[PDB]
Amino acid sequence: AHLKKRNRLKKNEDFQKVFKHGTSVANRQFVLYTLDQAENDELRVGLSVSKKIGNAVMRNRIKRLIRQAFLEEKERLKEKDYIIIARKAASQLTYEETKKSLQHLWRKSSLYKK
């Protein structure tokens, strides 16, 4: 299906809080930010995509691939606030490549239950 509204990070303040007071990891295609939520009975994902990737269709495409990867792995992951930044290198990735890159970041950040 699609990643639910519950599982998406919206408010501008919510993003800023993650960047400022939260833990960070990065690889070649992605930067992953994690912020612990006491009150999160559920996982939330927010996305930032560089203007460097210049096709709105492409930015949308990568964004969708990231959401799907999160949706698939959701049960496995701890309930927290995530922000994913997509680098220019992330631009041509397939879903399996995107999933693999994120999975590597998730493992590195110890975000896997249980």
Side-chain angles (χ1 to χ4, degrees), residues 1-38 40-114:
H2 305 290
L3 194 71
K4 295 136 139 210
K5 254 220 230 270
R6 67 167 111 293
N7 299 134
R8 293 179 198 217
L9 201 76
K10 267 271 210 323
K11 296 222 107 289
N12 175 75
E13 41 259 288
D14 283 358
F15 275 65
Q16 282 328 291
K17 163 211 279 148
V18 169
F19 286 135
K20 268 127 122 166
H21 289 268
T23 292
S24 215
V25 174
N27 72 16
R28 183 154 56 267
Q29 41 267 356
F30 299 120
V31 167
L32 164 58
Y33 270 96
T34 304
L35 172 78
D36 237 309
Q37 223 32 80
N40 260 27
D41 275 317
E42 282 255 308
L43 153 183
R44 326 193 290 176
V45 212
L47 298 170
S48 155
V49 182
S50 57
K51 234 252 138 327
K52 260 248 106 224
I53 303 152
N55 254 353
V57 77
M58 248 151 98
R59 303 223 274 117
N60 290 355
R61 187 204 158 245
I62 182 70
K63 253 137 111 153
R64 205 160 266 134
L65 272 5
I66 292 148
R67 280 190 224 101
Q68 168 176 322
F70 270 89
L71 172 76
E72 167 173 323
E73 205 96 326
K74 178 187 163 199
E75 317 281 16
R76 289 181 272 217
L77 302 173
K78 1 259 268 310
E79 304 67 9
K80 268 145 118 82
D81 278 3
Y82 299 72
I83 298 191
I84 287 286
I85 316 289
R87 314 235 253 153
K88 172 54 133 76
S91 89
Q92 286 188 37
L93 307 174
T94 216
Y95 175 73
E96 281 301 319
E97 340 216 289
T98 295
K99 176 166 156 227
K100 179 71 134 119
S101 193
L102 291 170
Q103 255 160 350
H104 158 265
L105 287 200
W106 287 328
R107 261 188 347 120
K108 231 237 44 44
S109 265
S110 284
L111 302 168
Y112 272 108
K113 328 132 76 128
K114 28 204 46 285

